[PDB]
Design a protein around this nucleic acid. Structure first.
Ligand SMILES: O=C1Nc2ccc(Cl)cc2[C@@](C#CC2CC2)(C(F)(F)F)O1
Ligand SMILES: [Ca+2]
Lengths: 543, 400
DNA sequence: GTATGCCTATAGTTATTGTGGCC
RNA sequence: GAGGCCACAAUAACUAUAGGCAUA
């Protein structure tokens, strides 16, 4: 006999006392008819004036207020399994319990809170009052309490049948084995008879579905898994709501369809916009939307997890801070695929985003398979040891190996560690006004040369990069630069191959063409020669 | 049992469990099964809504760590103001101290019934294919700060016989650890520890070698424009920690737009400023004193080539303590070793644990910190971007 | 002198929309 | 009685810590 789980309201709260609105006569006849049945079966009990509580009828009755007053539970659907995680099986059936909640009793002291009324037609007259004796539909606690009952109901069966795999999922059981179908079918029926001891019904053999099973949007076979087919509409006018669900279907595709990119369409959704705003697509979105539309013509599927083999993860650069990966155990039979896009916009170089992608994949591998994959990365082992020994933060990757599939991941330039003998020394500075958003950039050289341009609609940060833009533009193949901007010096040591600002990858092209660049920093406002002179020129009309 | 409560407005811990590898999940089911037989924990239902992360550690088989950082916070009045364990100032002055695990000394003591629900933890399952196994403690948990606070009484009564026969030796307890303060020599120390291990079975560090170290500036024959520019930037920045540092006479030398490679002769006025800047660094700092009422903070910088610099402080730029640590090894293994070394250092000296600022991405650290962890405590930590002048400044410490 | 004002990080958090679900 | 609940994603908004710049 299933024992009740003791349940309490939240400290300080009392039970619901919501009023019953009058209802149509055709509605009342339907309630009294199914309420008298549930009474006949012992699922509800008539009550009288001793009960102060009430919830209104709707899922038979609506328990909003009661759920707000009910204690919390440790919720059972912490996360969904992913299809990739599951092992291949020989025989799989899905049973759905059909009197699930009706067969779990409700803690005796809690029943008084579930009271509800069927009102009278004439409404001058009082109504029939009832309360629940079993877990009610729509009550916050029903799923976790039912799941706890199911788990102990299945523990004897699980111990007696080690090789069988029962996965509980709401009202459904999913059962798998490597037994052959006949001996599978025998075990399924013993399980039906077991569940039936506690009054839990299930479809007989003639009524059980066959593979594939539709579950959580997946299509589950015994030897493979896929997603249900992904339709994306073709329009000429595109509203922001439409682009929302485009990005949603693509993000859902990207788990099995490789090489999907959405960062171009997400960029259209930046900033506020009423949902019917008819936003015109940027054309390099249509590029990406083209690539995506044809990638979905392909047929795809995922395979299940063989524990006896290694996991392999291989990552490709799709460009513009977009990356894509595949996980497989045997070549060209993928378990799943995914994407990674930095979209902070932060200036980050490809070596770093790569390391970020592997850290996302490592986390996901431990959730799905309980172990970390071996990596195949488009980066040379010395190029990586170059960056991650000069970099300030720690990291760590598990086993990885180089794999030569372009575009590779290289450090585009290399600044000098010491100053370049015989190279012209430029001293740069910028300055801007907040009030008039107006400013100047410039430089001053030890060989006597100087230059000052006036910019419009800038910030102090922008002018300090412009000044570096000028020194690199008006100088030879070997330069020493000194700036006082810890910002400019910093954004250049970290070498952001992508960016949203034209000025900064502009500067990165200049640094690419140059043969030897040494970049140094002095503090502003200290009477240091060179910096003092240029700061005087740049801040003249500005401050 | 002693009644425990929370602050009157606090809720129980509701911390999500970080995902675990299958090797550690198997190891945890083994450990918790035996603990369930022996009465130490009990399976619980879904009517208990509290949770506290659980991990697996090697620590010289396997071992269960329960990260009670959040529950300790919510009971801090209980184990600090009420039953707290006072600190021995003499402990850091011992020539040598060694560390003892007394974890198994809690399992006998029962735990207040109305308080056990707050101690719930969840062994998770791979791929969420299984609900998750939910225990709760019936005895005093290793890693809850209330545990030594409650075992406090019975710990004085279990050591007074040894402490009466050795009233010179100071011994102090933080969490599941005992610290043995001695001045005896290496031989007459280890004999004493294995004696106390037999006195208790009935029922390797030296704080003097730790020394705040001086900064040393380059010593050069030919100073260059660049050399000086690098040095005033560093000194100008360190005048926030040594306010008697000046750069006026070094900047006088950089008059006009000079090429970076040009040699500058040190005038006598510069050569003086430099020579006392050196003297301010080769001697201690002043006006910096420990404050019992403020949190300690510990910041680590990656220096490269397997070496690291740390500072323990309570307000920016006022370092109670600084030092260096250096190394088949990776950053995370090294970082994890520094954090433990810095913490036990901070434990003996002040009887508190510092809150760490770590130069690593949070995701990465959550993945691997459990690999080489060996302590029963886990300290508070957060994730920071080290600014370049901080790395450059503490490089220049000297080596022991 | 001591305070405000604006940006960037590393994190935390509440809300909307969406994809895939469920009740 | 104007659906709630889960995972993921995008967008927006605000708490802390550190850093920077600017101005009074
Ligand atoms: O481990 C396996 N292997 C497997 C292969 C195919 C199918 Cl269709 C089902 C499974 C199974 C499951 C499940 C939940 C996602 C519903 C089963 F429990 F056995 F049903 O779990
Ligand atoms: Ca400036």
């Amino acid at each position: 006999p299933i024992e009740t789980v003791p349940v309490k309201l939240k400290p300080g709260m009392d039970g619901p006392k919501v009023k019953q609105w009058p209802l149509t006569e055709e509605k009342i006849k339907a309630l009294v008819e199914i309420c008298t049945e549930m009474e006949k079966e012992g699922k509800i009990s008539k009550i009288g004036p001793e009960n102060p509580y009430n919830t209104p009828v709707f899922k038979l009755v609506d328990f909003r207020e009661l759920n707000k007053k009910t204690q919390d539970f440790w919720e059972v659907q912490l996360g969904i399994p992913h299809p990739a995680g599951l092992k291949k099986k020989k025989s799989v059936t899905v049973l759905d319990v059909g009197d699930a909640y009706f067969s779990v009793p409700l803690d005796e002291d809690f029943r008084k809170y579930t009271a509800f009324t069927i009102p009278s037609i004439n409404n001058e007259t009082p109504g029939i009052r009832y309360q629940y004796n079993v877990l009610p539909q729509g009550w916050k606690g029903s799923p976790a309490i039912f799941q706890s009952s199911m788990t102990k109901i299945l523990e004897p069966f699980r111990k007696q049948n080690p090789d069988i795999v029962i996965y509980q999922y709401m009202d459904d059981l999913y059962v798998g084995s490597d037994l052959e179908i006949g001996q599978h079918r025998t075990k399924i029926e013993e399980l039906r008879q077991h569940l039936l001891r506690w009054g839990l019904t299930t479809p007989d053999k003639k009524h059980q579905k066959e593979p594939p099973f539709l579950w959580m949007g997946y299509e589950l076979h015994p030897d493979k898994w896929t997603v249900q087919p992904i339709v994306l509409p073709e329009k000429d006018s595109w509203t922001v709501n439409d682009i929302q669900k485009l990005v949603g279907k693509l993000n859902w595709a990207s788990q099995i369809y490789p090489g999907i990119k959405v960062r171009q369409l997400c960029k259209l959704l930046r900033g506020t916009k009423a949902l019917t705003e008819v936003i015109p697509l940027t054309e390099e979105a249509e590029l990406e939307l083209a690539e995506n539309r044809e990638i979905l013509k392909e047929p795809v599927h995922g395979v299940y997890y063989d524990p006896s083999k290694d996991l392999i993860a291989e990552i490709q650069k799709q460009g513009q801070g977009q990356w894509t990966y595949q996980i497989y155990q045997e070549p060209f039979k993928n378990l799943k695929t995914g994407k990674y896009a930095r979209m902070r916009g932060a200036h980050t170089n490809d070596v770093k985003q790569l390391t970020e992608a592997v850290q996302k994949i490592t986390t996901e591998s431990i959730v799905i398979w309980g172990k970390t994959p071996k990596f195949k990365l488009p980066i040379q082992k010395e190029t990586w040891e170059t960056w991650w020994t000069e970099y300030w933060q720690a990291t760590w990757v598990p086993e990885w190996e180089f794999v030569n599939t372009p575009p590779l991941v290289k450090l585009w330039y290399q600044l000098e560690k010491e100053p370049i003998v015989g190279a012209e020394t430029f001293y740069v500075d910028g300055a801007a006004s907040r009030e008039t958003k107006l400013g100047k950039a410039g430089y001053v050289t030890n060989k006597g040369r100087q230059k000052v341009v006036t910019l419009t609609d800038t910030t102090n940060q922008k002018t300090e990069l412009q000044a570096i833009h000028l020194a690199l533009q008006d100088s030879g193949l070997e330069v020493n630069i000194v700036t006082d901007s810890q910002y400019a010096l910093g954004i250049i040591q970290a070498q952001p191959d992508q960016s949203e600002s034209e000025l900064v990858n502009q500067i990165i092209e200049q640094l690419i063409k140059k043969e030897k660049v040494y970049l140094a920093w002095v503090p502003a406002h200290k009477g240091i020669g060179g910096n003092e002179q240029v700061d005087k020129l740049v801040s003249a009309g500005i401050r | 049992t002693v009644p425990v409560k929370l602050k009157p407005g606090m809720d129980g811990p509701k911390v999500k469990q970080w995902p675990l590898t299958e090797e550690k999940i198997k190891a945890l089911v083994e450990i918790c099964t035996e603990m369930e037989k022996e009465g130490k924990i009990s399976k619980i239902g879904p009517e208990n809504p509290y949770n506290t992360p659980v991990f697996a550690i090697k620590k010289k088989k396997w071992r269960k760590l329960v990260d009670f950082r959040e529950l300790n916070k919510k009971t801090q009045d209980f184990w600090e103001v009420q039953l707290g364990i006072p600190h021995p100032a003499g402990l850091k002055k011992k020539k040598s101290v060694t560390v003892l695990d007394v974890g198994d000394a809690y399992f006998s003591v029962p735990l207040d019934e109305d308080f056990r629900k707050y101690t719930a933890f969840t062994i998770p399952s791979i791929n969420n294919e299984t609900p998750g196994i939910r225990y709760q403690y019936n005895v005093l948990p290793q890693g809850w700060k209330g545990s030594p606070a409650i075992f406090q009484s019975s710990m004085t009564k279990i050591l007074e016989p040894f402490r009466k026969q050795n009233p010179d030796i100071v011994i102090y307890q933080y969490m599941d650890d005992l610290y043995v303060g001695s001045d005896l020599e290496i031989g007459q120390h280890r004999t004493k520890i294995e004696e106390l291990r037999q006195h208790l079975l009935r029922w390797e560090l030296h704080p003097d070698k730790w020394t705040v170290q001086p900064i040393v500036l380059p010593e050069k024959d030919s100073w260059t424009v660049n050399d000086i520019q690098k040095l005033v930037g560093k000194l100008n920045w360190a005048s926030q920690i040594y306010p008697g540092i000046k750069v006026r006479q070094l900047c006088k030398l950089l008059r006009g737009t000079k090429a970076l490679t040009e040699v500058i002769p040190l005038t006598e006025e510069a050569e003086l400023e430099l020579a006392e800047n050196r003297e301010i660094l080769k001697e201690p700092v002043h006006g910096v004193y420990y404050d019992p009422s403020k949190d300690l903070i510990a910041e680590i910088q990656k220096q490269g080539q397997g070496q690291w610099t740390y500072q323990i402080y309570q307000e920016p730029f006022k370092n109670l303590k600084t030092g260096k640590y250096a190394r088949h090894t990776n950053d995370v293994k090294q970082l994890t070793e520094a954090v433990q070394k810095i913490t036990t250092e901070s434990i003996v000296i002040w009887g508190k644990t510092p809150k760490f600022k770590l130069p690593i991405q949070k995701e990465t650290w959550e993945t691997w910190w459990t690999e080489y962890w060996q302590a029963t405590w886990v300290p508070e930590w957060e994730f920071v971007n080290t600014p370049p002048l901080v790395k450059l400044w503490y490089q220049l410490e000297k080596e022991p």
